[PDB]
Curated annotation (Swiss-Prot), chains B, D:
MF annotations from Gene Ontology: ATP binding
Domain of life: Eukaryota
Family note: Belongs to the actin family. ARP1 subfamily.
Protein name: Alpha-centractin
Gene assigned in the entry: ACTR1A
Subunit structure comment from the entry: Part of the ACTR1A/ACTB filament around which the dynactin complex is built. The filament contains 8 copies of ACTR1A and 1 ACTB. Interacts with dynein and adapters such as BICD2. Interacts with BCCIP (isoform 2/alpha).
Keyword terms: Acetylation, ATP-binding, Cytoplasm, Cytoskeleton, Nucleotide-binding
Function of the molecule: Part of the ACTR1A/ACTB filament around which the dynactin complex is built. The dynactin multiprotein complex activates the molecular motor dynein for ultra-processive transport along microtubules.
Lineage, highest ranks first: Eukaryota, Metazoa, Chordata, Craniata, Vertebrata
Gene3D superfamilies on file: 3.30.420.40, Actin, Chain A, domain 4
Curated annotation (Swiss-Prot), chain C:
Species this protein is from: Sus scrofa (Pig)
One of the Pfam families matching this protein, by short name: Actin
Subunit structure, interactors included: Polymerization of globular actin (G-actin) leads to a structural filament (F-actin) in the form of a two-stranded helix. Each actin can bind to 4 others. Identified in a IGF2BP1-dependent mRNP granule complex containing untranslated mRNAs. Component of the BAF complex, which includes at least actin (ACTB), ARID1A, ARID1B/BAF250, SMARCA2, SMARCA4/BRG1, ACTL6A/BAF53, ACTL6B/BAF53B, SMARCE1/BAF57 SMARCC1/BAF155, SMARCC2/BAF170, SMARCB1/SNF5/INI1, and one or more of SMARCD1/BAF60A, SMARCD2/BAF60B, or SMARCD3/BAF60C. In muscle cells, the BAF complex also contains DPF3.
Further comment: In vertebrates 3 main groups of actin isoforms, alpha, beta and gamma have been identified. The alpha actins are found in muscle tissues and are a major constituent of the contractile apparatus. The beta and gamma actins coexist in most cell types as components of the cytoskeleton and as mediators of internal cell motility.
Entry-annotated residues carrying Methionine (R)-sulfoxide: 39, 42
Stored Gene3D superfamilies: 3.30.420.40, Actin, Chain A, domain 4
UniProt catalytic activity: ATP + H2O = ADP + phosphate + H(+)
PROSITE patterns, alphabetized: ACTINS_1, ACTINS_2, ACTINS_ACT_LIKE
Protein name: Actin, cytoplasmic 1
């Protein structure tokens, strides 16, 4: 979208893997 | 009188403005008043003698800049009145203060005197029909669409972490520091002088912010980066003179994690996030760990969220699912939630009207916010 | 309505406000004759002024009143003003206001004495003293830009941005046209063309105006002068005698770019302008590089703008786009600016008055100037 | 190899040298390299063509003086190498560089590149067995005998206030400004051109320093002195020609307190002294106010200490015991403490040995100084 500052390819979140 | 209300997202670094029910703020400009250093001999000069917004960004070199807000606490009240007047004026909004209700923002655990004097400005000097003051964390969660969430924010003035769970903000679990983007930029400036390149003026200070925004990253292991020798990357000024930054680019944002570098023992960003989850009740901790939301400008460093994960893995209990979420629109997250909050029909009940302010005073404003 | 009088050290220029070019143009000289006991026939003037001294040059001791933009003899300067008003312009100073010009970083007593002579002796209704560079920039049309002004009195630089002069970045220079004329006269004596008396000072000045030009590369021009004799031009004097010089055309104005020839131990005009721009704020250097304005007679050498472009680019970083504003009418740029300043309606409230001078004194001018 | 170690108190204006355990430095001379302007035709002249020390002071007019060090940061490294070689040579010390260890001095918060280049010169060009770089504030306290107290200093290069409480220097409270004696002397010269008596040459610049040292005073109330008219007191030059100084004598050293006069928005001496005390922790502030130590040559102006106290009374909290102490030999304060520090047995542990430098490099020097 429009406006000066964005970050491209950080991702929405960083998550640990879910174990059983 | 229920017109389309205005959303003034305050902050020491940047001030966002616009109307309710919009996707993104149309009016974003940095929060400072610029006044000229030099004498105007020649006629046909830049009139007014007070510069706010894009004029001040364009003509930095002339203007002795000074920030009215430090750590979400307005020091110079005359300067903020001029900025809020500039926001309302024809150069930005093109509307009167009398028509629209106002949505103001503040950091949590601020001085109550500043909140009272803020209300005084909007009700007396400007003639506002209704004012409402809100938190950053509650607005960030409105923008995402969640209810559960720990909001680790990092603006220019303040860093804090309010743990909300299913629409229940816990006021005593709030952890706050006065270490943030401005102090990192001030710490980078001090390093650049130790490297060689000196900057001292207030117009010259914003170059250091631009270097900090562009060329800075957080090392995953700082001891490993210390032992190794850096590459020394370059940067071009508006002048054109090249600057070898060196190790100061990675050591600058370490102020956020190690606040002992500036010489002021605080918790740190990662410790504030853990302490906020720990101060809350036992059964709420695992849900608060799963919903960690990021916001503000000082979360935009390269490898910030990766390091913030690793610090939580070090501190928090083992075998727990950590999820540090962070939307695409982190800078305008607080404004978007305010625009969403303003558009809802419940907004009419929450605000403080002018009639209610004239009758009661400051006590009614303190009651309605909490 | 108002009169503009650019009291230059060489050519004293004067005329009316709101005009294209000045009417009264003449060299500021006061030739007093050879006082011997023998008589003189059918009467004569005791002390000649202006073009009369230039016409009857052979006998008269030509003494300039202004030396390096500093009035040495005040009785001589008073006679030249009198010659400007009554003889040339043909109008009394009591009716018309009077705009004057001095170079920046001059003695503070000189403005006070200049103003005292205007009010007490000449009985002026209103007066003002402007900076020469500020008028030169105003003649060119731009509000922004540094002005490398260079006359026979004083070379100087005044960086200005968006109608805001930078008084501390000003750099006055002792090198000027008179020092170049004296240098040309010395190197003429080295090749068997001796000029001692002050009558020959104007001939060598006229040689300097015609033949001399700025070298693009000095070491290359010296090599070509030794090889070929095509560059060696000839100039005939007022007398039927004609003389030829080869090296001295390019070598004379090189003293501007290499002050070491004259024995001044100062910075050259190319790097003095650079040093002025570097003393300014870092954010407003690009516009000063873009608007490198020239003015005065010492900038009327052919190829000077090309040499300034070569040297400033060599000093400055490679990324910068250097550009010299060199108009056709840069010889009379200071007066044109004063005529445009006098023509504006805003300048009517900026004058000094007789009643204000009687209340305050000579010290009021320092407040009004800048 | 533990010989009687050499102390070299480095400075932009003056450089002072000798041996450890001496009461006063025997070898005090000015830090510049004079080189002859004029050509040497006649035989039996001054040989060498590079003049340092008393020969340069004796023969000012011949030599184009240039200072290698500005603001405690050497620009011309070849000239400083020649000065250090002149210090070690038979004309001053009469010793070899290989025998004695070296105590060098530098200002705080300098470029680290200069510190590495300083070490390279002492270890490789000279063959020093052991080197140690120290701060001016720590040495001044060694000289007095104290451990507590703020050290306000003001030489020709730098003005900096370092708060030290009971042998604990706080690096994040160290304030610094590039507004010292050289900038005051430069500002005095610019004022003397406004008065009338202009100076331009580099040998002629040292006359302004002599005028600054002798005939200057800092008034308590500057607004009261501005309203009153000065007496215009005289001073005789080395030639013989008299100079009426006027208001340039008292307004020149005002630069130290008002840095807006030269055109550079900085703190000033009095603000730096308060800011350094305020940046420290709450409990140490009252002890830091009670112990204030002055140093350097630019603290020797008339009514400087009286103005400093008035400014501290204005800024600092009310009802606090202020005490601005000083040594008798304010110019030799830093050297005496170095001579004391050198003669201590611990000095062997503090220094960087030649073997340690050859193994590690710049990192070991950055580990031992701070």
């Amino acid at each position: 979208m429009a406006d000066p500052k964005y970050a491209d390819l950080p991702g929405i979140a960083r998550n640990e893997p879910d174990v059983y | 009188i229920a017109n389309q209300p205005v959303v003034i997202d305050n902050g020491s670094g940047v001030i966002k403005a616009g109307f309710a029910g919009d996707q993104i703020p149309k009016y974003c400009f940095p929060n400072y008043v610029g006044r000229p250093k030099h004498v105007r001999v020649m006629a046909g000069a830049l009139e007014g003698d007070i510069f706010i917004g894009p004029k001040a960004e364009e003509h930095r070199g002339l203007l002795s800049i000074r920030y009215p807000m430090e750590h979400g606490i307005v020091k110079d009240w005359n300067d903020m009145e001029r900025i809020w007047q500039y926001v309302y004026s024809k150069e930005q909004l093109q509307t009167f203060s009398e028509e629209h209700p106002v949505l103001l923002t503040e950091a949590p655990l601020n001085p109550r005197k500043n909140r009272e004097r803020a209300a005084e400005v909007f009700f007396e000097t400007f003639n506002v029909p209704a004012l409402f003051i809100s938190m950053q964390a509650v607005l960030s969660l409105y923008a995402t669409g969640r209810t559960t969430g720990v909001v680790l924010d990092s603006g220019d003035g303040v860093t804090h972490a309010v743990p909300i769970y299913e629409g229940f903000a816990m006021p005593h679990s709030i952890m706050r520091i006065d270490i943030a983007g401005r102090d990192v930029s001030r710490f980078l400036r001090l390093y650049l002088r130790k490297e060689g390149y000196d900057f001292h003026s207030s117009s010259e200070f914003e170059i250091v912010k631009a270097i900090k925004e562009r060329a800075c990253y957080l090392s995953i292991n700082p001891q490993k980066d210390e032992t190794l020798e850096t590459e020394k990357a370059q940067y071009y000024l508006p002048d054109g003179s090249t600057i070898e930054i060196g190790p100061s680019r990675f050591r600058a944002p370490e102020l956020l994690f190690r606040p002992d570098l500036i010489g002021e023992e605080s918790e740190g960003i990662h410790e504030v996030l853990v302490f906020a989850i720990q101060k809350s009740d036992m059964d709420l901790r695992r849900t608060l760990f799963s919903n960690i939301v990021l916001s503000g400008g000082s979360t935009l460093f390269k490898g910030f969220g990766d390091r913030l994960l690793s610090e939580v893995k070090k501190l928090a209990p083992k075998d727990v699912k950590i999820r540090i979420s962070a939307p695409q629109e982190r800078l305008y997250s607080t404004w978007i939630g305010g625009s969403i909050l303003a558009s809802l029909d419940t907004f009419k009940k929450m605000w403080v009207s002018k009639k209610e302010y004239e009758e009661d005073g400051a006590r009614s404003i303190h009651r309605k916010t909490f | 309505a108002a009169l503009v009088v650019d009291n230059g050290s060489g050519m004293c220029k004067a005329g009316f406000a709101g005009d294209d070019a000045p009417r009264a143009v003449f060299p500021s000289i006061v030739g007093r004759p050879r006082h011997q006991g023998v008589m003189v026939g059918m009467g004569q003037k005791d002390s000649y002024v202006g073009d009369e001294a230039q016409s009857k040059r052979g006998i008269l001791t030509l003494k300039y009143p202004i030396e390096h933009g500093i009035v040495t003899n005040w009785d001589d300067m008073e006679k030249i003003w009198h010659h400007t008003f009554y003889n040339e312009l043909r109008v009394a100073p009591e009716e018309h206001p009077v705009l004057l010009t001095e170079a920046p970083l001059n003695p503070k007593a000189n403005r006070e004495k200049m103003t005292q002579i205007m009010f007490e002796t000449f009985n002026t209704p209103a007066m003002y003293v402007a900076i020469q560079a500020v008028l030169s920039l105003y003649a060119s049309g731009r509000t922004t830009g540094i002005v490398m002004d260079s006359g026979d009195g004083v070379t100087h630089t005044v960086p200005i941005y968006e109608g805001y002069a930078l008084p501390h970045a000003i750099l006055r220079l002792d090198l000027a046209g008179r020092d170049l004329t004296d240098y040309l006269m010395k190197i003429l004596t080295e090749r068997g063309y001796s000029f001692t008396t002050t009558a020959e000072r104007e001939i060598v000045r006229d040689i300097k105006e015609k033949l001399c030009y700025v070298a693009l590369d000095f070491e290359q021009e010296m090599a070509t002068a030794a090889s070929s004799s095509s560059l060696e031009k000839s100039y005939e004097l007022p007398d039927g005698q004609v003389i030829t010089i080869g090296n001295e055309r390019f070598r004379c104005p090189e003293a501007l770019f290499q002050p070491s020839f004259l024995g001044m131990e100062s910075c050259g005009i190319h790097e003095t302008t650079f040093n002025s721009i570097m003393k300014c704020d870092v954010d407003i250097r690009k516009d000063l590089y873009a608007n490198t304005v020239l003015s005065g007679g010492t900038t009327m050498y052919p190829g000077i703008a090309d040499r300034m472009q070569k040297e400033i680019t060599a000093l400055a970083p490679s990324t910068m786009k250097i550009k010299i504003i060199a108009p056709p009418e840069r010889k009379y740029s200071v007066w044109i600016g004063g005529s445009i300043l006098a023509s504006l309606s805003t300048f009517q409230q900026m004058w000094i008055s007789k009643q204000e001078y009687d209340e305050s004194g000579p010290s009021i001018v320092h407040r009004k100037c800048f």
